[PDB]
Paper text:
In 2016, a research group from Keio University identified a novel PET-hydrolyzing enzyme named PETase from the bacterium Ideonella sakaiensis 201-F614. One of the most important characteristics of PETase is its ability to degrade hcPET at a low temperature (30 °C); due to this property, PETase is a promising candidate for a practical method of recycling PET. For PETase, the portion circled in the structure is the active site, which is much broader than those of the other PET hydrolases; this active site may explain why PETase can accommodate a large substrate, such as PET, at moderate temperatures. The enzymatic degradation of PET is a two-step process in which the enzyme binds to the polymer substrate and subsequently catalyzes hydrolytic cleavage.
Numbering used by the authors: 2 to 264
Write the structure that this text describes.
């Protein structure tokens, strides 16, 4: 009769492009991180039911400030988000994946802790992974090793191997056209091309440097619209987002677009 995971009013193009969605957002610092360096948790106060969880990791030498804007933007549409700092700023993708999954593990334990702000707010069976550069490589390793994850959306990914043909998780890849650290022709695009068994999408930002999807970027309307809709459609099975998730935006800010196995 109804989707038990659907939350919030019917989405529109304007509402997905605004800086904030429908729910009020609060946040707190993790007092004693378990297996990673530091973490901030963003959550909705009034979503009307339990919601899925997303863990986000930055890149080599980077910290939480680079990916922070995703916290309030995703949480305000009905998600619990944890953004992390790694044990060392110089950790490699394999280690970054380990710490991303330890962060999801701790969010799950906080759901059962009555003193926590997110006590009872999380559906621990529905989780997803995001991250930038080496942390986006780490996100793909996480999905390849843990196929119960519901969604993946790395940005400017990099890894020592481009072969991710074992990934069965729905994966959205954000790429930046003018990336000189993890160039599209030698990382993001071969990574996308290796995935043969999943719903997938490739979205390359016109004229974008390596940090084209970080906090402060000038395409937050489009990037945020696509990120929220992808997570809504595949973590929540919410078919109100099916067109927003799979469609070609037909935008002057996208220089390359590709999708497979979506509808």
């Amino acid at each position: 009769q109804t989707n038990p995971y659907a939350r919030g009013p019917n989405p529109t193009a304007a509402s997905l492009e605004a800086s904030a969605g429908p729910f009020t957002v609060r946040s707190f610092t993790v007092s004693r991180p378990s297996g990673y360096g530091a973490g901030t948790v963003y959550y909705p106060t009034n979503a009307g039911g339990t919601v899925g969880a997303i863990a986000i990791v930055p890149g080599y030498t980077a910290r939480q400030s680079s990916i922070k804007w995703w916290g309030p933007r995703l949480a305000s549409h009905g998600f619990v988000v944890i953004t992390i700092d790694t044990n060392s700023t110089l950790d490699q993708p394999s280690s970054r994946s380990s710490q991303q999954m330890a962060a999801l593990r701790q969010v799950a334990s906080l759901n059962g802790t009555s003193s926590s702000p997110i006590y009872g707010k999380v559906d621990t069976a529905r989780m997803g992974v995001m991250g930038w550069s080496m942390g986006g490589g780490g996100s793909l390793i996480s999905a390849a090793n843990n196929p119960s994850l519901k969604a993946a959306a790395p940005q400017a990914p990099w890894d020592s191997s481009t072969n991710f043909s074992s990934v069965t998780v729905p994966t959205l890849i954000f790429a930046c056209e003018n990336d000189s650290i993890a160039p599209v022709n030698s990382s993001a695009l071969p990574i996308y091309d290796s995935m043969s068994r999943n719903a997938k999408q490739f979205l390359e930002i016109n004229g974008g440097s390596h940090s084209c999807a970080n906090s402060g970027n000038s395409n937050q309307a489009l990037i945020g619209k696509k990120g929220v809709a992808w997570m809504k459609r595949f973590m929540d099975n919410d078919t109100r987002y099916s067109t927003f998730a799979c469609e070609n935006p037909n935008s002057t800010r996208v220089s390359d677009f590709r999708t497979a196995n979506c509808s």
